[PDB]
Every structure is written in structure tokens, then in C-alpha cells.
């Protein structure tokens, strides 16, 4: 489709507008379809957790004020608490930098049965990491050539994500594609609305100088890491209502692929359970 | 303070707390509606708590099997947004956990300031099944550890841990879901009979019933030993799901109300810099942005 | 007990000289005895690890260049790798500060059978934390009284260390008491010796302006947290050879009190193991080296 | 030597690697002394590695019970200072570890740059006992996971994980302590007969011997599938402890030599500030 990228070297960011709304032009229709999706997401979550077969990472990667937290909140607040974690990837700590860049990411992968939301991800290491060439200023072995760091990261990311797939963990990778002007509108709202002032930071503003280089880094990453098993989704982010609709559709269709079910217990277990049932009935004279 | 809130030591008589009390709200449909209103208020409080990053909250459920821990967590606390929430079931300790001290695994799960951690079971298991089955007698420990004071030292150390947490901006809500033995049996029958619930039944669920009375006494002992003003116990009648969900929603709302979270007010320095950012943004687009202020 | 403080409100730092050497006046004797102690520490560690009954924290708290790392290295390199962790407590990360201050410390406590060395400790929260009043700049609930933060930390620390003791974890708390001048000598060496340059920092120099306040904070902490179960050891730190001797003595004598032993198997296990012995011998037609030659 | 080092795929014949080869050093006392020389050098390199904070080292021992893992770790690596050292035994996975993917618990234990982590057993357990006992057939996983390719996918994913670590300044030394069944028996008899060693013996130690030949096959298969230039396997004869300790000391010291750690040299600006501090210190004590 128009938003799913599932092969390498097949992505042109200029062809993906930030304000496309072609799947559903009517805002109230989209709001309602979102609510239908959310109810199904809930139901699938309950089955996933009962079965304990397969985990799911829901990863959002986007510029500041593109919509990550608000999309996470509005679309996934319907989930029950059981088996859910949300992990924001912030500027790495000293300990995290002292380790390898996937250490903190792999640590947060969900168990089978569980859902982990990533607010940012391992892709920071080929986004800000690439744009600011952070590897040039970081401690590493003399034998690491700076000229292969980024290409090795794309290979290693491909390999890590495939390893996860092969071990019953799927990843949903969502790029919330916001325009520079819409970012500005949202920033002004963070400044002007006292309830939002806590969400604005110096680094939010400072990234704007590098806007075009970030766009290029996104394009490069999506070209390097989109596969059938681990696709990228490029979601127009200029309208929150439409972005929340599209994300709800991606999550529900991925859960449908996983097809979780309540487990069937073995015939032996069922016979033992029937024994316990009789004992319970006998204890209360069959008045239960 | 309340019929259900125990907030002083040595003040608890479990036989005076009926499993089927419903005195705060006798009408099921009233309670269902009020619970939904509570859940919205919990969400609103959570958003402020998360913004402020001042105080963390543990919501701990301790109860017998099929008392309603998971059901209550799901129906009431699905209100929360995902941000800043963890749910931690305490299961039979692993080798590594047993090789450590018993609070190690529990302290590791404590929330950050601004965050909420739900405990499905807790450190109290170490004075419930730990006491009932005298598990300390079969566990590795130093020769100098006096077996006769293990449990009393646990109540003291738990009091001190919870007070330490309170002194460091972490509150704990301790909820005992007080179910009857018969209602437990009814819920077990449903786990057996309903295919969608069969995964939730275990041999150990049935086998704990032999120790029912000993567990009741251990609960009473623990609540007598650890209820304080800062770290009270709530004894919630559990025989009606609708009522238990109402009461739990009320406890959570009222605790968040006491925490009184607010969206942070930024310093004068931040405000000055924000004015500069606003102007730069406006100038970049020739003042063609949505502003709530005049130009 | 000239160096051991084991009761509350019983410590006067001015009575503890940084250059006392009264337990062993002869350097070469002390060097030899330290080597003997190190071998004994290794032997005890092997028994401790086998038994899996009791854990040990060895915690060093001192100013920069007092000799924490060098003493850890020279004395505790005796240990086999199995069951050992060394945990330096640095400036807390965002995550650590978002948690409660004992979170990161409790996470690092050893398992039964194991030894964790703390280079700095939870006491930083009543040392630099008290000196610089760091609690005034940190996120916390409005109901927290800033004026009782430090006193509550001494009570909570006492309680945490007692809790550990009650759960089979001992703590050795060592204050390496160096003089301001000897610190200056050691700083000069870090500057002048190329292989040591990496160990010097601006913050090392800058702490010297707060020397007296740090001394007072150490005194306050030792007054507030010394007990029979969790004593403090105030070790003169102006001579490395003597400091290493004294530390080796404290560690040997603490392990001796723990009295670790290789475990004895149960009668049931012994019978099974005797059966396995027979099977092994029969498999090789008795051509195995047995200490019961038949 | 290239007699013990395997550094290419599909190049390994276990039957040609005898458990009692001693061809690098036939004289026990010469070997014991060379071991002590190596140990002094390992210590020196450890100090520099820790100062530099550029590269981490995993020293992984994978071997049957009583092959010599603990005793080799102890005798060869007790000379290490405690700073920057961890030892991690991989035991039977806990419920939480099984709920996660099999590399989660392994990757969590990887050392920081500057640090050394000893692995007693490793991620290779998942293609040793995991293969021998077909543990994946009894473990929760997604329905889409092909049981017939689980082990092959594990070799691929292990190759990719180890390469990823190498690309991120973490080396791994993989040591197979190749002990004979008879020598295992001799060592087990000692564990039974010496009361101080009884704690080291278990029913599972004795029970593994029924699968001896399947384990030998699994080792051969693993070493064929995972030996590379950057992440070689070392097949160390384990029937004589003195010789095994010598060879392990040689592998570790030569790997550290390759890492070539150095005490850092500070920048000219920092040096000038330090010279400022030196003067102030000298002035404070009147040049004493
Ligand atoms: N691997 C990595 N390397 C460098 N920066 C990273 C990173 N992973 C995330 N970050 C950065 O951390 C920031 C996290 O954004 P978030 O909105 O959570 O915090 P913030 O804006 O308050 C943090 P800051 O203090 O940097 O402004 C972003 O600037 C993001 O690019
Ligand atoms: N500190 C502790 N010591 C001993 N048992 C503990 C414990 N903490 C929790 N447990 C026990 O672990 C069990 C956890 O039950 P839970 O309902 O989560 O099922 P489970 O997933 O552990 C498998 P099962 O249904 O067979 O119990 C309870 O029996 C609880 O008492
Ligand atoms: N809880 C705490 N609160 C604040 N600061 C803390 C702390 N725990 C440790 N620290 C501080 O962190 C520093 C730890 O020193 P560290 O060993 O990281 O090196 P450093 O940055 O001083 C470089 P150098 O090797 O030159 O001394 C000390 O200044 C110590 O007081
Ligand atoms: N990934 C994994 N899957 C299954 N078993 C694993 C494993 N990793 C390690 N193990 C097993 O765990 C055991 C750990 O060996 P070790 O000799 O330390 O333990 P142990 O003998 O104390 C366990 P016990 O005494 O219960 O038999 C070995 O049998 C090893 O094969
Ligand atoms: Mg965000
Ligand atoms: Mg929710
Ligand atoms: Mg930012
Ligand atoms: Mg439950
Ligand atoms: Mg149970
Ligand atoms: Mg130090
Ligand atoms: Mg050592
Ligand atoms: Mg310092
Ligand atoms: Mg071993
Ligand atoms: Mg074994």
C-alpha cells in the first residue's frame, strides 16, 4: 500500500506527503473507525496475553511534536495494564553509552504474550546518530572504522529485527511524517498553553536547524531496513485524527496476523479439572 | 478512618470485615456508573502526575486466587494511559530471586516519580505463603539467623521499607480483596466450565484451599503489623465484582486527590527563553501560525 | 577498638589521626602480613561461595585519592572472579534520580555466597548530598520537608542496613581517612605521571574547597549509622602500605566471624552419590583413581 | 595455534581434536611457568583496558560438567583486579528468561567498554542442550515458527549477534574445553569422594552422561556453524588441567595483545589546566 514499505531500496520520501488523507476523508468517519479498531485491539490483547506465544513491539519514530505520545495515548489507553510496558528512549546515559547501542533496546523487548510500546527506538542511532555523526565523538575501539559505522548499523538492525521475528517477537515500525510548519504550530501550542509547557525543551527547538538532514536520515533508514517481516509504515502526521486512525488500522491488522487465541488445555488437564469441579460441587452439596 | 481503611497497628479483626458488605453503594447500576466516572478522574490525575514527575504510586493487590485481582486491575486500571505504567505480578521466586534478599525483587519494581506501578501480589507474600508454609525453614540463610524471629523481623522491615518509600516520594496503596471460600469456589467452577478461562486454572489454585484458615490468619497478622497512617491497608469486600471495582476505583481516586498532582509551572528563566522561541517561530512563517495571543 | 566504631553518637573525627600506624609500625612486616591475609581471604571466599548462605558488601567511602581504588585492587585482587562484583557509585543518572536513592544501591546487593565491593555507596546521599544540599534541586513531592531530608536518610540507612543483616547480608563500611595534604601529594602524582593523567579531573580539585564540610558530613554519618551489626572502620589513609594492611585485617576478621564452611550433603544425597560412584567404577572396570582402592 | 583455533565455517572435525593433546608444551613445569608469565601480562593489559574505556571482552567457556570451566576461570583469572570484572554463569533458564527471547539474558550481561565479563556457559546452551533435548518443541512460541529450522536460525542469529558485538567494540573469546568421558568420570568420582567437593556434584551432572555422544555432535555442529575470523572458536584439550590452564592463558593474553589497550593521553588544553592546578597545590603548601 501507499503507507507500507516492505522491501529494501524502495522508498522516496518526497512521494509521501505529510497531509495525505486518502484512506478516509471524513473526520467523524475516521474517529468512529478508530473506536471500532480500538475495541478489536483490546480483544486481541486479552487473547495474546492468555496464549503467551508471541510478543509485539509498537515502535514510533518521529520528530518532536509529530504525534508520538498523543497517538500512543489516544489509540492505546484502551489496553489493560497486564503485559504492557511503554519505553521512551531518551538521550543515552553514561551506562548506556558504555554498553553497545542495542543493549538498552534489547533489554526492553516484550515477553511472549506482551506488548511494549517504544517511544523512539534503536533507530535514533541512525537518525540523530547519523545527522550529528555522534560516533565520531564516542568511545570505541581503534579498529572501528568511522566510514562503516552507519552501514554496519543498518545491517545489524536488519539482523536484530529478523532475530526477534524468528523468536516470536514482531515489530511495528511507524514513522509519523510531520511537516516542519505543523511542528512549529504544535511547538507554539506547547509554549502558549500552560498545561503543555513541561513538554517543550531546548533540544526540540534546536533540531529544526537540521530538519532536512533528519528527513534524509529517515529516508536512508527506511530504504535500508524495510522487509516483509519488519516493514515500515509512513503515516501522514499533519492531522492528529487521521494519524490516530491509520495507526489504529496498522495495530489491529498486525494483531489479526498474529491471530491470538485463548489456549485449549490438554485432555489430561481437562480430566483433572473435572475431578476438582466434582470436589467443589460435593463440598457445597451441588449448590453453586 | 473508614469501615474499610485500617491505618493503625494492632487494630484489625478480620471476622468483623464481611466478604459481602456493600454498604457504600447498594445499587449495582449506580455503582457501575460512578465507577466509570471515577475511572475518567483517575486518567486525568495520572496525566498531571506524569507531567509533574514528583511522586510515584504503587497500587498493590494482595488476595487469594480468584478474589478478583486481575479482573479489578483490568476493569478499573485500564483507565490509565500507557505512559509511565508498569504492572508487576509477583510469582513464585526464581533461583536468582531466592539467592537475593526478599525485598530485592520488590524494590527493583518501585515506580519512578511521576509513574504508577501495579503490584499483583507483593512483598507481603513473604509473610503470607512465607509464614503459612514456614518457607524460611527450607531456604538458604546464615546460621546466625534466628528462625523464631524471621517473621517478626519481616513485619518490622516491611514497615521500615514502606516508610522509607513514603519519605522518598513513593506512596503505596495496599488493597486486600477479601473473598469468601464459597465465592472462590464459584469462580473456580467458572474457570473450569468456560473454555476462555481454562488457561487461568491450576492445580495450585485448588490445593491452596486446604490452607484457607491459615492464610486468613496470616492476612490478619500482616494487616495488624503493617497498617499506618502513611501506608494504610484497605480491606475490600470481594464477593461482588461490581462493588469491589467501585470501591477500588474510589480508593485510587482519593489517593491521587491527596497527592494533588499539577501540571508544572516553569521557571522565569524557561519563560524568557520560550518567549524567544515563540518570536523566532512566528518570524520564520511571517506570523502565519495559530497563536492565542495578539500580534 | 581504635578504628572500629560500633555505637551511635560515639565518634570524634579529630581523635582519629590520618597517619596513625600503631597496629604495625614496620612497613616490610606489614607488607608480608598483608600477603598472608590476602591468601586467607581467598580461602574464606571459596567456602562462602560453596555454602551460599551469606553475602558480603565491602564498602569504601572516602575523599578522592584517599586510596579506594588502589586498596581495592591490591587487597581484593585476592578474590577469585566467581561471585564477585565491583560497583562504583558515580553521579546518578536521570533514571537513578527519578527513582528513590536506595533503588540503585539495593539493586547491587550481593546474593548469598557472593561479595560485592562498593566504591562509594548509599552514603554519598548524606555526604555530597548533605554538603551541597542536592535534595533542594531534585524533584520530590511537595509534602517532603526539606529540613528533615537528611535526618530521615540516617534513619532509613540504619533501617536498610539492619534489614540486610536480618537477611544474611553483612556490610563492612570503611572510611579511608586521608589528610588534605596527602590528597594534594597524590593529586600531584596523577598530574605528573602520564599513566595516571586519566584519573585526574576538574571535580577532584574543586571538592577541596568543601574539605571541611565533607569532614563534618563524614563525622555526622559515622555518628548516625555505626552499630554492632553494621560498624564503621576509620582507617588511617596517609600511608598506602598501612591502609592496605588494615583493610586486609578487617576483611579477614569479618570473614572469620561469618565462619563459612563447605556444605555437608544430606544422607539421601550421599546415598545417591555412592550409587553413582559404583556405576562409574563399573563402567570403567574399576580403572578410575579412587581414594578407596579396593 | 591453528591446531586449536577454528576461524572458518564448515572446517571442523571434532574427532581430529583429541582431548589429551599436549603438543604446544610437553613439560608440565614449563607450562605452569609460562602460565604465570601470561597471567602477569593479562593483569597489566586489564589495567590499561579499564583506563581506556574503548573495548570490552567476553571470555566464554562452554563445556560439559567437570571439563574444567570453574577451575580454569579461578586459576587463570584470579590475578585480575576486581574493577570492571563480572562473572556470569548461565544456568537453567528461569520462567522470566524463557518468556523472553533466548539472547535477552545473554545480551543483558555483555560488558561495557573497558570491562571483562566471564561467561560460564553461554548463548551456545540454546544449540547444545537446546538441540540435544529439542527443548524448543516443548517451549511456548508462535504457531508460525518452523520447528525444523529453529536450530539453523539460531546458528544464523548467533553469528549475527557476535558480529554485531564485534562491530560495537565487544570481542568474544569462545573456548570449548574438550574433556573425555573417562576424565569427566575421574573428576566426578573426586567430587563424590572428597566431602569439600560434594556441593559441586548433582544428579543432572551424572544424567547428562547418557547423552554424551549427542552433546559431542552438537558441539561439532555449533563450531562448524559459528567459527569466524572475528569470533573464532578455540578447542582446548581438557584432560590435563595444567595444560588447559596454559592454553587458556595464551588465548586470553594474545587476544588482549590484539586489543592493544593503552593508558589514555589527555588533550593539550586539559594538560594546561592540570598544570594550573599543580601550581595552586604547590603554592598552598609553600612548594613542600
Ligand atoms: N541513541 C540516541 N543518541 C542520541 N540522542 C538520542 C538517542 N535516543 C534518543 N535521543 C534523543 O533524546 C531526546 C528524547 O526526546 P524526549 O522528547 O523524550 O526528551 P527531551 O526533549 O526533554 C530531552 P533533551 O533534554 O535532550 O531535550 C531526543 O532529542 C532524541 O533524539
Ligand atoms: N515470595 C513468595 N514466596 C512464595 N510463593 C510466592 C511468593 N510470591 C508469590 N508467590 C506465589 O506464586 C503464585 C503466583 O500465582 P499466579 O496466580 O500468578 O500463577 P502462576 O502464573 O504463578 C502459575 P499457577 O497458576 O500454577 O500458580 C502464588 O501461589 C503466590 O503465592
Ligand atoms: N548519590 C550521589 N549524589 C551525587 N553525586 C554522587 C553520588 N554518588 C556519587 N556521586 C559523585 O560522583 C563522583 C564519582 O566519581 P567518579 O569515580 O565517577 O569520577 P570523576 O568524574 O570524579 C573523575 P576522576 O577519576 O578524575 O575522579 C564523586 O564526585 C561522587 O561524590
Ligand atoms: N539455555 C539453557 N537451556 C537449558 N538448560 C540450560 C541453558 N543454559 C544452561 N543450562 C543448563 O543449566 C545447567 C547449569 O550448570 P551448573 O553446572 O551451573 O548448574 P547446576 O548443576 O547447579 C543445576 P542442578 O544442580 O539443578 O542440576 C547445565 O545443565 C546447563 O546445560
Ligand atoms: Mg514523545
Ligand atoms: Mg489503559
Ligand atoms: Mg528533542
Ligand atoms: Mg491474578
Ligand atoms: Mg496459587
Ligand atoms: Mg575511586
Ligand atoms: Mg582477583
Ligand atoms: Mg570527584
Ligand atoms: Mg562450572
Ligand atoms: Mg549439568
Residue numbers in the entry:
A (entry chain C): 3 to 290
B (entry chain B): 2 to 296
C (entry chain A): 3 to 296
D (entry chain D): 2 to 289
Excerpt from the paper describing this PDB structure:
EbPPK2 is a class III polyphosphate kinase that accepts a surprisingly broad range of substrates. PPKs catalyse the transfer of phosphate groups between adenosine-5′-triphosphate (ATP), as “energy currency” of the cell, and polyphosphate (polyP), a linear polymer of up to hundreds of phosphate units, as energy storage. While PPK2-I enzymes prefer the reaction from ADP to ATP, PPK2-II enzymes favour the reaction from AMP to ADP. The PPK2-III enzymes catalyse both aforementioned phosphorylation reactions, making this subclass the ideal source for enzymes used in ATP recycling or ATP analogue generation. The enzyme forms a homotetramer with four active sites and a polybasic patch which guides the polyP through a tunnel to the active site adjacent to the Walker A motif.
To better understand nucleotide binding and catalysis, we determined the crystal structure of EbPPK2 at 1.7 Å resolution bound to a non-hydrolysable ATP analogue and polyphosphate. The nucleotide-binding cleft, occupied by ACP, positions the 5′-phosphates towards the active site confined by two Mg2+ ions (grey). In the ACP-bound structure, the binding pocket is clearly occupied by the nucleoside while the phosphate backbone is less well defined (ESI†). The nucleobase is bound in a pocket formed by S93/P94 on one and I130/L136 on the other side. R106 contacts the N7 position (3.2 Å) and D127 coordinates the N6-position (3.0 Å) of ACP. The C2 position is exposed to solvent, indicating tolerance for modifications in this position. Notably, the 5′-phosphates are oriented away from the active site and face toward the lid module (ESI†), not observed in other PPK2 class III structures. Compared to similar PPK2 structures (ESI†), the lid helix closes the nucleotide pocket tightly, allowing S203 and D206 to interact with the γ-phosphate.
